[PDB]
Design a protein around this ligand. Sequence first.
Ligand SMILES: Nc1ncnc2c1ncn2[C@@H]1O[C@H](COS(=O)(=O)NC(=O)[C@@H](N)CO)[C@@H](O)[C@H]1O
Ligand SMILES: Nc1ncnc2c1ncn2[C@@H]1O[C@H](COS(=O)(=O)NC(=O)[C@@H](N)CO)[C@@H](O)[C@H]1O
Ligand SMILES: [Mg+2]
Ligand SMILES: [Mg+2]
Lengths: 420, 420
Amino acid sequence: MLDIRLFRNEPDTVKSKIELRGDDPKVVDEILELDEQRRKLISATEEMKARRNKVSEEIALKKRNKADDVIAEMRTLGDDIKEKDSQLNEIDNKMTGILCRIPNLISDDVPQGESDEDNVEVKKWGTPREFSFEPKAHWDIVEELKMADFDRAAKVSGARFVYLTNEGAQLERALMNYMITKHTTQHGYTEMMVPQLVNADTMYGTGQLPKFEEDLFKVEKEGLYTIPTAEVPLTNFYRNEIIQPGVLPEKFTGQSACFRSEADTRGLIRLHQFDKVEMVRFEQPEDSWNALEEMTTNAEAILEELGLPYRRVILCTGDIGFSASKTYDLEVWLPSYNDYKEISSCSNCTDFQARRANIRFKRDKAAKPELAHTLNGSGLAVGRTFAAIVENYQNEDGTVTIPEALVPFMGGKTQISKPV
Amino acid sequence: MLDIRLFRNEPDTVKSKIELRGDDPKVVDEILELDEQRRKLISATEEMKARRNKVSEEIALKKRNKADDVIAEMRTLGDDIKEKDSQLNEIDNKMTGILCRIPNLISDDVPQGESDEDNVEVKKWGTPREFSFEPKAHWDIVEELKMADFDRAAKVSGARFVYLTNEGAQLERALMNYMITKHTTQHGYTEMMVPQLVNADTMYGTGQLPKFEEDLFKVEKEGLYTIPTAEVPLTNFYRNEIIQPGVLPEKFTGQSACFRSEADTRGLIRLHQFDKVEMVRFEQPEDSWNALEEMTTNAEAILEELGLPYRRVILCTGDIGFSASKTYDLEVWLPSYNDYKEISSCSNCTDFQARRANIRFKRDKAAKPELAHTLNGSGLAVGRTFAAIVENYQNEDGTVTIPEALVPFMGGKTQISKPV
Ligand SMILES: Nc1ncnc2c1ncn2[C@@H]1O[C@H](COS(=O)(=O)NC(=O)[C@@H](N)CO)[C@@H](O)[C@H]1O
Ligand SMILES: Nc1ncnc2c1ncn2[C@@H]1O[C@H](COS(=O)(=O)NC(=O)[C@@H](N)CO)[C@@H](O)[C@H]1O
Ligand SMILES: [Mg+2]
Ligand SMILES: [Mg+2]
């Protein structure tokens, strides 16, 4: 949810930032037109309330002095104010309807672009493996090693679901334990487990509603939605609340299953359900930009310790998502793709979700409440890490060497071997 | 789904087993009435097909000898057979509709009873803690120690959801890792991770549909339901399939979030979403009774190693669930309840779900396919274990001592202390 004051005070800047995203800047003129109508309605109600005060004083003065016309005028004024109050509620809801549909205003350093080809590479770590044999794609390895089953999951849930089996399920679990342990013991995040079903206010809070309802699984009877990411319940933990002095920064981490209706046919890259270890931060506004850097680094630490070559990019104006003001994506080397593939999205949402969800804070007991800033980042999407591991750690015999940091999380196992 | 042959061959036994559950045995008479109508329809179609053969031979004989009446009779016979075929499809669907709604036939050793008071205690292990101070209930301890948050979860998901926080989330994770490690490394189960959203055929497969649809969260657009237990996708792994020779017994274990609409106001005992480490077995019919015993023992091993006093009961006829032929429940000592509280349900479903889901097997390559037996058991419901741990391991200062076997799963921590 955008600040109406920016439309009033810097409309050209707002038009520029909307246009840069590939969106229609004319919405700024539509908003200001409604704002002027709203301003006139309020101003006219105030002249009516003042007129009513004069009328009521006259009725009281005539009651003491010893209306019929001042009684009739009082009735008309009462009627007109009631009408103006309903008209104002309507214009407000109309303005809110438009405003909640506008993406977060991009930060100044977001580079201009039209597609993911215009995303700016800011860093590369590690060198893609140079194989002595033809590398197998992760979908073939997981079937050969009986780590995952797609066909049987299609039977029970339809396309783009999977069963993780034996060492496949063990590796998924080991990745989540490793990722959480890293973020909690080394990066100062507090572990959290969240509800996977949330109401519409929560989905609105983080920006998935109203625009992205069709990307979600909806439970119509109870009014719930499956979460597309732990970001949704993690950020909404402080919805409609004033965070207390001395609490910020609040750093949360945790795993959750993630559900996306998805309104990449082979494999783990795009499923309706996947696991992700999420990072969520609540920051003071002057701390959010450093927090984005620290958070992106926290996600890179997983790739680095897992020995997975990657690149960090800044999403261009045409590619950045709805709630972010600035996003870095981490893209992992995927031999089957012969390119880097997105494994994380780290964003600073500024005050966008905080305004939507009414997440405020106070610096001291006397301080005026302020909107917090919120950030979210994948640390990491588990299935895409699992995919990167099996492709990059595959052996010539078709086995998969367990990355060193995951060996103590795999009960001391060092290799994923072929079925007995 | 029951075997129609038992209604034909032992109707009194079927009536007796239905009546013992508190159900109406008159359904056996309704089924046999439809079966007789069905038998007459088939028999009459067969006399018609035989008559048609005589008629067609006559038409061919008249065509060679040198229809109009045998042509007209042939048309009538064709019409009548088509009518009888639609009538048979209808009676079959009507019979299937009734049959799929009848619970599994109880085994002979299920004791007669009307409620959970008639469940027969078969064993007790450990002695309930004798406190030197008034024990706090788990809902107060989790709030005091900041291990769980109910109020904030009500904000995002409504009543009976929870956020597990800090050491609370760490303990939930440690319980799942410990439980899975135990079942896979000591009890011979294969680790599995499953889709949490399944279609209607899968929900029918394990018996939740059609009778218990209102206990589930339904995603109407995609035709999916959230799983109430990993039993649903785990048992359905082999739906519409013939398990190969030498494969049985198939033993699966895994955690999943579990979702129940629940059509115990304070705490972790009854939530819409909870975690559970499930055990599922596919057995040859002559192995399922021993498998129930072994599986119940596997669940008890968690309680025993965690130092949690419990009792094992056999559910009485009036208390046993829909798909089970025989169930043992494990009930853990809960100081706040001043009694044992169900923490696991271990069941032998015999061929009930296998018939519903068409789960078959072959003993050798030439063998005739047979229905497998399926079993499912909690090892354990995680939230109820978490609740039992905080109440039974609580200290006088309000801290919670970490049970010995969970210390290496808690990063070496030995106590859950009060907030810093
Ligand atoms: N359908 C999907 N299947 C599997 N993984 C996915 C899917 N969609 C996204 N991901 C992974 O999940 C990551 C995070 O998803 S995101 O929409 O980009 N961003 C978020 O969800 C933020 N909350 C940060 O995690 C992506 O970077 C990608 O690696
Ligand atoms: N609403 C709930 N909230 C929390 N725990 C629950 C809830 N319902 C059941 N449980 C726990 O989950 C266990 C298994 O649930 S069950 O319906 O009895 N049986 C099954 O689900 C079988 N698949 C065996 O696990 C119960 O024994 C109980 O300890
Ligand atoms: Mg993305
Ligand atoms: Mg039960």
